[PDB]
């Protein structure tokens, strides 16, 4: 009916799982709600991996029977991966970014089909993870990676968290140069050695 918009971006769980193709290897969207959403993704999008960024309490709140989703994945040869991060929490997204990205980049490199990256709405966590991936592993800077995502799938993923994760992986002696004491554009882009260091540390998180 008639209604003021709660916030700038709203999650309409009642409209079913939604998603957006961002690059050919990479889909970002909301939680699959049923085993049938897995079949959809296999049949329509050649998805061979699911990266789920939700906590257990998210999954309980949204009433999802994750065991049956995961069972369907196994039946269809899809690999289902969990890397939880807190909802509405940019410091949690930041802390978990490197592990989440290692799972996504591993899957893309394995090459069996597309990767479906999701959180609850795919408005916060999953877009952040995807933007970090395109920045660190697809030879862009942070602003270009950010716009690649939000121009296709509008939302306000937290840029500071991604930039802060880039610092966490790349900066020598952080205690000497705290993130908060550095110019705001710091680590919006990276030198070649930094890009190589970040990639080595991310790939070394594989299977951890």
Ligand X SMILES: OC[C@H]1O[C@H](O[C@H]2[C@H](O)[C@@H](O)[C@@H](O[C@H]3[C@H](O)[C@@H](O)[C@@H](O[C@H]4[C@H](O)[C@@H](O)[C@@H](O[C@H]5[C@H](O)[C@@H](O)[C@@H](O[C@H]6[C@H](O)[C@@H](O)[C@@H](O)O[C@@H]6CO)O[C@@H]5CO)O[C@@H]4CO)O[C@@H]3CO)O[C@@H]2CO)[C@H](O)[C@@H](O)[C@@H]1O
Ligand Y SMILES: OC[C@H]1O[C@H](O[C@H]2[C@H](O)[C@@H](O)[C@@H](O[C@H]3[C@H](O)[C@@H](O)[C@@H](O[C@H]4[C@H](O)[C@@H](O)[C@@H](O[C@H]5[C@H](O)[C@@H](O)[C@@H](O)O[C@@H]5CO)O[C@@H]4CO)O[C@@H]3CO)O[C@@H]2CO)[C@H](O)[C@@H](O)[C@@H]1O
Q: Which does 46 bind (CB under 5 to 8 A by kind): ligand X, ligand Y, none?
A: none
Which position among 21, 76, 81, 140 is part of the footprint of ligand X (CB under 6 A)?
81
Residue 82 binds which one of ligand X, ligand Y, none, with CB within 5 to 8 A depending on kind?
ligand X
Q: Which tokens go with 56? A: 């257990």
Site string (113-152) toward ligand Y, x via CB under 6 A: ----------------------------x-x---------
Residue 195 contact partner, candidates ligand X, ligand Y, none, CB within 5 to 8 A by sort of partner: none
Characterize 3-38 residue by residue with b for buried, 16 or more Cβ atoms within 10 angstroms of its Cβ, and e for exposed: eeeeeeeebeeeeebebbebbebbbbbbbbeebebb
Q: Give the residue with the Cβ less far from ligand X, 50 or 190.
A: 50
Binding partner of residue 206 among ligand Y, ligand X, none, CB cut-off 5 to 8 Å per kind: ligand X
Extract the tokens encoding 196: 């190589």
Taking CB within 5 to 8 Å according to partner kind, which of ligand X, ligand Y, none is near residue 190?
Answer: ligand Y
CB of 170 to ligand Y, least distance (A): 7
Contacted entry of ligand Y, ligand X, none for residue 37, CB cut-off 5 to 8 Å set by kind: none
Whether 81 and 103 have beta carbons less than 8 Å apart is answered as: yes
* Count of residues interacting with ligand X (CB under 6 A): 25
Residues 6+ apart with CB under 8 A from 184: none
**Residue placing its CB nearer to ligand X in the complex, 37 or 171:** 37
CA-based Rg of the chain, rounded to a whole angstrom? Answer: 17
d(CA 165, CA 161): 6
Handedness of CA 186, 191, 194, 198 (dihedral sign): positive
Structure tokens at 152: 């296709």
Query: For residues 106-145, which are near ligand X according to CB under 6 A?
Result: 106, 120-121, 123-124
Site string for ligand X, 177-206 (x = CB under 6 A): -----------------------------x
Parallel, antiparallel, or unpaired: how do β-strands 114-118 and 26-29 relate?
parallel
Q: What is the DSSP string of 118-165?
A: E-SSSSSHHHHHHHHHHHHHTT--HHHHHHHHHHHS-----HHHHHHH
Q: Which residues bind ligand X (CB under 6 A)?
A: 7-11, 61, 79, 81-83, 87-88, 102-103, 106, 120-121, 123-124, 155-157, 206-208
């Amino acid at each position: 009916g008639s209604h003021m918009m709660r916030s700038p971006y709203e999650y309409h769980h009642d409209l079913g799982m939604n998603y957006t193709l961002i690059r050919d290897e990479l889909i970002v969207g909301s939680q699959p709600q049923k085993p049938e959403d897995i079949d959809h993704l296999k049949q329509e999008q050649n998805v061979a991996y699911i990266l789920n960024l939700q906590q257990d309490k998210d999954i309980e709140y949204w009433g999802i029977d994750l065991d049956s989703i995961v069972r369907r994945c196994k039946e269809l040869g899809i690999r289902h991966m969990r890397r939880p991060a807190k909802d509405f929490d940019p410091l949690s997204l930041r802390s978990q970014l490197p592990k989440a990205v290692s799972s996504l980049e591993w899957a893309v490199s394995e090459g069996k089909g597309r990767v479906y990256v999701h959180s609850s709405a795919g408005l916060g966590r999953a877009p952040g993870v995807s933007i970090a991936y395109m920045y660190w592993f697809c030879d862009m800077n942070l602003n270009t990676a950010y716009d690649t995502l939000v121009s296709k799938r509008p939302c306000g993923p937290n840029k500071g968290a991604i930039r802060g994760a880039t610092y966490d992986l790349a900066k020598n002696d952080p205690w000497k140069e705290p993130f908060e004491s550095l110019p705001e554009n710091a680590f919006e882009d990276i030198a070649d050695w930094e890009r190589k260091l970040i990639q080595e540390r991310v790939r070394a998180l594989r299977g951890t």
